[PDB]
Design a protein around this ligand. Structure first.
Ligand code: ADP
Ligand code: ADP
Ligand code: ADP
Ligand code: ADP
Ligand code: ADP
Ligand code: MG
Ligand code: MG
Ligand code: MG
Ligand code: MG
Ligand code: MG
Lengths: 371, 371, 371, 371, 371
């Protein structure tokens, strides 16, 4: 029977079947619960809402993310999300479908242990596997060597792979992603008089960030241009009909990716993280890591980030080297595409973790069979 | 046995059976007592008259309203009204009928406490329930979301409800209703030489207000038209055969709904009250509160008030929003219709307050079982 | 010449001279305008009243606050307040006195821009400066490290400072303060039959809140004690001689500081806000933030709030940590005391913004010279 | 030239010059016409008699009052009264004197319209003004705040004024005054066998009421004292030499001021009218309305009415309030004294309605320039 | 005058006087700079902090090590460290004290060239000398023959010396020391959910490594024991009061000394490095190198490393040989003790490099006078 590929990110869930080109079900990973007083009896009122139903009714709901910084904090809500993506969205029975799941590098065991235990004793599958998202992003690119930067909603990580061999000592993880940018835009939108304090308007600020923000090639020149004339200002329409206008905040929000000290973090930018991941490898592969910078995730979808990354890496690298950033138009779903490519391979069918080996070894085989 | 739905307003009492379309008994909530000297012996003279009997004999009676601004001030007269509406009008025994009663928001406890105590120890019912009139007005409209303005004889209140969930912090109450408009018309009818000073002629002024008054779309243009030509003047016939004529007072009387400073009140108009109730809610529901303005009560029955409300709310709201005022022709009795819909539901039968729970918990369960 | 320190809160104005211990002029920030019809000619009738004159004549006035939630909404009224506090209360000429002003964190630019423009082109000063109120509250405490919670009439904010260095990413702002508590007490005083609907009786409800309210150590035990016996009931005398009595409402009103869901807000309490501000900082300073909780403002003057805050923070913090709440008896004016300490320092005289730099740079230097 | 102050009451006319302490001409407002057959030729027989000439010849005249309940019913007789008070009593030419006139509150327009038209086209004045009698009664008292009860021959009205600002929604008008008391004494004087049926003996009954009537402090104790012993009986001498004796009727006649049901009226007493006028105002001014009860008019000249009013208002008001009734010895003419004070003010000279503005605006400016 | 002995390691600085038993000043070699925004004026704020002052204030500082892998990378910070250890800690004038300094083998010239230039033109000394740390570690042991392994914070080196004659072709240098172990513990502490990402918490991880880590005698048996029962788990208290618990990571961290492939290095362990250094010497001295294995440095202070080293060397050496590891309790400071012994010898006073020879030969005599 067809295998299931489910990418469980911190903000979005992308589930579908192996062998397909696009994920069938893409929905936000939120659980909404009522916060006001119900006065009308009956009419099918539910105590919880999952996915697009929580987003459509978000004016009377408190929204919670079960995953924070790539780590599942609430397990009942995560089970609700998995039940919704198995029975309501994909409309399949999980007892007859192997499931491929994704996970961020440098994570604790207990996330993967409880993931395997929930997938084998609650939504009991014939087989399961946990894969690294950067290896799938390199699978979707069609190449073998390269350094992958995957930035999503909680985790931004750099993983270099040369000729199918990964270097785990150069894998870097940074807890700066799109939710931090949404919080920073929430903070700096009060600088013009716009107040967004609750969880429902966090989605509005996230929509503003998705539609109107961009990465500047030169930061100081863009701030000088924004201070000189009002040519970079853009208008947005609120759901209640109000119109807001933003200026430099279109490029100050993603600049925290390159300058984390805007939100008080001591770490370096993503360009310096990529460069330090390259020079922590062997020297004879660094050239092949310079021409194969693969970018994946929804956070890498700003329309100025590839040229800016090429500029900073060329400023850091020696001048005799070719820097080439790979930014495909479908890099928002490249982890799922790589998972669908990997699950359809004939050489992958011996690497599943079946139910018999789970019963024989306990929930600890997942660290000796996966990476 | 069939449940009883009784709407006890400040000016009118509407009682009937659950499952019906119209209330069976609609009569004014007045108690009349003689004020002159009786000279003929016997002939069935009573010390008090309740309802239409007090209205027909009002020339020799002092009329008192037991409810003022939604609060019951006289309890013996209110017991007389309840006895009249149980034994004389509805012609039922209250020991075998559950009773549903209505109440205004932001009221004291002691009204509801003594209401439950009188209904359980004097007209002892198998069950009773107290409901919010705006929820019943939304029940009669057939919809789930909307902001309800209910204006009657004592209380004008705004309650917003989104998807069956009410927002109690945006509930607004204003003590300006039809009795204040009757008093203002009583005051400004002396400006043409007509003197109405007693309680019997207050009913005549109320009849003049019901038949001849209307809400102007533009106030200053209508005053200019009334000062220019005598085309807005209307004639009324008094019970003694006198004929009076009124001009601008047809639209100056309900203008106190939009300008309370005519009677010396510092509060804003009903349109500003509705707009401030909408913007005190969550933003993502405000659009659904803009297209579902539900109007209920006898005070909203002037033939100019819906267009005027749409004009003022569209002037207050942003221009990209759709304002739609819901004014059904049967909105004078919509609270009773919603009560009859609610009492006939199969999911409501577990929300009654029976006599056993009243004996177990005392007369204080009515604040933990009702809203 | 002596510098002027003026704290412009949302409800109160505290103005005086630098180097003093107490503010010279403390008066409410209200502008009153007549709403009735004047019938006596002459006798010095004014079109507006500012300060204590508006409070003494409040029975015939509509009172407006120029500042709402720390943001100046009306600028002519704010200019009237500044003219009253410069020429009538302090009795000084502003052309020969530098002025120090206070402002809430996370505010828009345009408040500070128009503040500098009004202070330099209408009440033209030799120099001016805008300071953060939490830094002044830490100045008045005499210490260097600590986390300051300042709660006034519009803004409740948490700012942590370690060894003179502030952490702006942990600064939290919540729009729940004493005016919201006054409105909630206005709402729940109708539950006993007391109606306060106008702006003049809002001051009466504020006086009731100032004299009779207190913070409960345990909320459920206090509600059980109030429901059991009438030992917590207190009586208050209205200006017209009426006597009211309140029970649980003495501690239900400030409980909105710890449970904002009483007024429909999704935010957490002030204790959780302080704890989340502490854990958003660096770890090695958190111990010094646990023993130096500094409380300032008039909203922190309830006689139960320090012990309750210590209890909730000790419940949130690990058990090996020392929690100490700093609540001095003069914390109602600690912002002014810190401003007077800062303006008298010899190292502060190079940080003024003079008129020449204002003319050279325009009204935009105030964001590069102040914080 | 000196302005004219003319108080046109329902029973008396008080005319004089501005700046004086007492009115120059005080005469009854009656027009007498012959009713018998004249038999002697010539000797200067007139078809009408106005003022004291009609009172001295009242045995052969029918006397008519042109003003009934503060409203002018006969305009030719009112023009005769104005001609008599301009040319015969004051002995002035009205073409060179501005005239100040008084009027009761809650009156029709057409009284004031025809008053202005007659004063500008028949007794054509350079300027004219119409003022409220209660504002003049507060002017004569020398104070600014207070609630004025003015009771004369047709109208008893309560007007509260705080700090020069009047509250028109608390202005109360009652059509019970000295002519109703004269009619009630005329009715109850037949209970001892004395018949007064014509208009000439109405003046005799009015004289009996002025000389012999008084207000009882306790009504039931005084009726018990009158029924026990004949110590309250007083004797009066008729113009034909007959001697009458009255007992309880000395205090039963003004008791209709406190109990209108003696003459079949449903309204409350003057004390309840004053108390309801006080509590219909703002709360913060009610204390200043409790210590400044100003009494004016000839009906308030009974020698028991101030103590009785203090007793009933103290019984109605809460016990922590100071009730003080202001009853000056010259309160019979206080409206004229206040008019003379107002017409002599230098700030009043811009509030006259001149002949040019009357020609420009028609006879309708008097409602936009006066109150 | 007394000579100064200053051991400048990669992590610690140990300075003192010749002829003493213990170093007077031991402090970390860190320079801290502020990273947040200063808001309080004056109060002695410094732009840099050196030594224990940077460690005590590390929550608001970025900490930098001037020496990396035994090579000085930042020279201004190294001059700051030398100024702090000359003027603030030792409290001496460097113009009257000769200074003895230490250096790692197989280092570049330019470190020693700039060291001599800074010591002669900035902190100008009468004389200076640079010595090999292993020769000083053999001086402190009191013996003449032996092979010294010195492992500190950046450099782990093996130097064999027989009868006072060193063999430079058998000197081995490996860039694996305590900072690499701290980084590996930082990496593997995320495996249990503990995140340490900044430079301040690197000191916390270093403290955890110093207090809780140990070297296992048999690695696989210890991993089996840790996987079987929780008897090797230890708890540590964070500065913010949090309690962490570690299991196998107590012995996985120093196992990188024996298995460098844990951090991706191709080199052999320290036991194989020592054995290959022994067999690269002459055969007739190897016996004297087998019984005189001298261990020095802070990295050799784990409480399992001597027995493990004896086990691995006895497994590598032939069975007829006596293996004896010399691990004195004061081997953390043995380089300074040997420097103090060498600087107090009467035969060493002719081997100083004075200022005259520095002026005559330039800064290149230090490679022909030292080793
Ligand atoms: N067009 C866009 N521009 C900027 N950011 C985007 C865009 N689309 C999505 N994002 C951001 O990407 C984040 C999630 O991306 P993705 O990696 O696909 O999901 P997840 O992180 O759940 O795996 C969201 O937080 C969103 O803010
Ligand atoms: N056609 C009408 N036009 C204007 N006002 C009306 C009309 N019909 C009724 N009213 C007013 O509505 C008030 C009562 O309305 P309703 O809400 O039905 O009763 P209650 O207030 O007792 O619940 C009365 O005071 C009356 O003046
Ligand atoms: N004793 C008190 N108890 C409770 N609240 C108080 C007390 N005194 C003042 N307040 C509240 O403090 C608020 C203003 O405090 P403060 O911060 O000094 O002024 P501002 O907010 O204008 O800076 C007022 O709204 C008032 O309700
Ligand atoms: N001493 C008195 N005692 C009682 N009533 C009096 C007395 N003097 C005058 N009145 C009454 O006052 C009435 C008129 O008073 P006043 O207000 O001065 O005149 P007007 O009503 O015409 O303005 C008369 O009807 C008269 O009966
Ligand atoms: N008790 C201990 N256990 C394990 N490691 C230690 C201990 N004490 C110190 N260290 C390590 O030794 C290193 C420095 O040792 P040392 O050689 O004395 O200083 P330097 O390397 O600066 O010359 C530090 O990185 C520290 O982690
Ligand atoms: Mg992802
Ligand atoms: Mg109703
Ligand atoms: Mg303040
Ligand atoms: Mg009068
Ligand atoms: Mg060393």
């Amino acid at each position: 029977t067809t295998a299931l590929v489910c990418d469980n990110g911190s903000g979005l869930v992308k589930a579908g079947f192996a062998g397909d080109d696009a994920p069938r079900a893409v929905f936000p990973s939120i659980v909404g619960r009522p916060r006001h007083q119900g006065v009308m009896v009956g009419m099918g009122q539910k105590d919880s809402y999952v996915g697009d139903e929580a987003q459509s009714k978000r004016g009377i709901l408190t929204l919670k993310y079960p995953i924070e910084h790539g780590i599942i904090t609430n397990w009942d809500d995560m089970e609700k999300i998995w039940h919704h993506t198995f029975y309501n969205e994909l409309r399949v029975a999980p007892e007859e479908h192997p499931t491929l799941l994704t996970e961020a590098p440098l994570n604790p065991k207990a996330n993967r242990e409880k993931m395997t235990q929930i997938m084998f004793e609650t939504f009991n599958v014939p087989a399961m596997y946990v894969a690294i998202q950067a290896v799938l992003s390199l699978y979707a690119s069609g190449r073998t060597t390269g350094i992958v930067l995957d930035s999503g909603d909680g985790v931004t990580h750099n993983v270099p792979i040369y000729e199918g061999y990964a270097l785990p000592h150069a894998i870097m993880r940074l807890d700066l992603a799109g939710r931090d940018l949404t919080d920073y835009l929430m903070k700096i939108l009060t600088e013009r008089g716009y107040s967004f304090v609750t969880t429902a308007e966090r989605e509005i600020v996230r929509d503003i960030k998705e539609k109107l923000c961009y990465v500047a090639l030169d930061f100081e020149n863009e701030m000088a241009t924004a201070a000189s004339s009002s040519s970079l200002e853009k208008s947005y329409e609120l759901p209640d009909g109000q119109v807001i206008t933003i200026g430099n905040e279109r490029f100050r929000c993603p600049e925290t990716l390159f300058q984390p000290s805007f939100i008080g973090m001591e770490s370096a930018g993503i360009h310096e993280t990529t460069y330090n991941s390259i020079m922590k490898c062997d020297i004879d592969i660094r050239k092949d890591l310079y021409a194969n910078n693969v970018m994946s995730g929804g956070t890498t979808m700003y329309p100025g980030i590839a040229d800016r990354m090429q500029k900073e890496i060329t400023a850091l690298a020696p001048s005799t080297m070719k820097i080439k950033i790979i930014a495909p138009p479908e890099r928002k779903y490249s982890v799922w595409i790589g998972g669908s490519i990997l699950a359809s391979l004939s050489t992958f069918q011996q690497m599943w973790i079946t139910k018999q080996e789970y019963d024989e070894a306990g929930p600890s085989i997942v660290h000796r069979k996966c990476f």
